Amino acid sequence: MVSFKAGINLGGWISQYQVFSKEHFDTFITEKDIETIAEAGFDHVRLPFDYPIIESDDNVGEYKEDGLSYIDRCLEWCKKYNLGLVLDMHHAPGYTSTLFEDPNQQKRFVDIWRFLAKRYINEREHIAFELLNQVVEPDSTRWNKLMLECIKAIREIDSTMWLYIGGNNYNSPDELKNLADIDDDYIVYNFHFYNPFFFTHQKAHWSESAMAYNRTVKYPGQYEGIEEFVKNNPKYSFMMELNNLKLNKELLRKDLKPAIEFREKKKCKLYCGEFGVIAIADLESRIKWHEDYISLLEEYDIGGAVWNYKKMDFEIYNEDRKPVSQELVNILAR
Numbered sequence: 001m002v003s004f005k006a007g008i009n010l011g012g013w014i015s016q017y018q019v020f021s022k023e024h025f026d027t028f029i030t031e032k033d034i035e036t037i038a039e040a041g042f043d044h045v046r047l048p049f050d051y052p053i054i055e056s057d058d059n060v061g062e063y064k065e066d067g068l069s070y071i072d073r074c075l076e077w078c079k080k081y082n083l084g085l086v087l088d089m090h091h092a093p094g095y096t097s098t099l100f101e102d103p104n105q106q107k108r109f110v111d112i113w114r115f116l117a118k119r120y121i122n123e124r125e126h127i128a129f130e131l132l133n134q135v136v137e138p139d140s141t142r143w144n145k146l147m148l149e150c151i152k153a154i155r156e157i158d159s160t161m162w163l164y165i166g167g168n169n170y171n172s173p174d175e176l177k178n179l180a181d182i183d184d185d186y187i188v189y190n191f192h193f194y195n196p197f198f199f200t201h202q203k204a205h206w207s208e209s210a211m212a213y214n215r216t217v218k219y220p221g222q223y224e225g226i227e228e229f230v231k232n233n234p235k236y237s238f239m240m241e242l243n244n245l246k247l248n249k250e251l252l253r254k255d256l257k258p259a260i261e262f263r264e265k266k267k268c269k270l271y272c273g274e275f276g277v278i279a280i281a282d283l284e285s286r287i288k289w290h291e292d293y294i295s296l297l298e299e300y301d302i303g304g305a306v307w308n309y310k311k312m313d314f315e316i317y318n319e320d321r322k323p324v325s326q327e328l329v330n331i332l333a334r
């Protein structure tokens with residue numbers, strides 16, 4: 001029995017890689033990592049991949065066996081340690097995202113999934129597919145169209161492959177209600193969870209509003225100096241609504257509600273593919289958030305995967321495969 005309830009992400013390997021290099025690809029994640037994860041009690045890993053390791057924009061259609069080898073070996077390592085694997089396309093063709101504008105990008109997208117479905121057709125227990133990681137559109141109309149075509153295409157080849165489908169605006173829990181009705185029994189609905197953003201992403205070097213705010217935040221606790229911050233930076237005036245907001249478990253439960261309600265109606269399976277706290281947050285707060293959040297997922301029977309195994313500013317493990325906090329790993333392995 002393979003399960004997909006308590007996992008961890010493998011970001012930074014064949015997705016969001018620093019430089020496209022074999023050295024990186026061959027050493028960032030090796031079997032020793034999958035073993036560590038397995039010994040820790042996680043039941044699966046989420047593997048984001050960016051299209052270019054599989055297909056080049058020039059000779060569109062020729063799939064690189066050198067890139068695929070990494071996914072293959074990871075599947076082997078997982079099979080060996082009885083872990084599940086959620087293969088996730090993090091960066092699609094064209095997705096300044098032309099994917100929903102250019103039918104050619106759409107064709108390539110579907111073809112890559114058709115290829116993978118065929119390639120792993122004999123693996124029935126250890127792998128699941130996550131079509132597109134985070135969409136950011138005015139509305140769900142175009143993604144719904146692309147998604148339905150992709151599901152259709154995959155079903156022609158594999159009728160029982162579990163597919164993980166997320167909604168608009170970074171797989172937001174309240175955008176699930178805007179997805180097209182997929183009449184299919186092998187679908188799991190995905191949503192990401194990083195609430196409260198200024199706590200989970202405090203001082204995030206890649207977040208302009210978070211870098212501008214440049215404020216340490218505790219949890220439980222509350223946002224401080226928002227009023228004084230907006231005064232100085234009228235550009236982030238929208239942040240005024242977060243003024244003195246109290247961060248606590250009931251706050252987290254309120255943000256999760258949209259997903260819970262969607263499931264009431266669809267009677268479907270939910271999954272939170274990404275959730276976490278930037279590693280520079282004080283340890284006590286960081287542990288407390290995960291404990292509170294994991295607690296809610298347990299309560300509502302939702303599986304998920306914490307961001308991130310190593311590196312990517314959200315590390316759970318040091319580069320020497322030792323956890324940053326053992327109590328944290330225990331909470332996360334459920």
Ligand SMILES: OC[C@H]1O[C@@H](O[C@H]2[C@H](O)[C@@H](O)[C@H](O)O[C@@H]2CO)[C@H](O)[C@@H](O)[C@@H]1O
Pocket residue numbers: 011016133134170206274307312313314
């Ligand atoms: O590349 C930007 C930034 O991404 C960070 O990870 C993301 C994750 O991939 C994304 O799906 C979600 O919306 O947010 C997380 C956390 O911001 C990663 O942690 C950074 O190192 C990276 O620079």
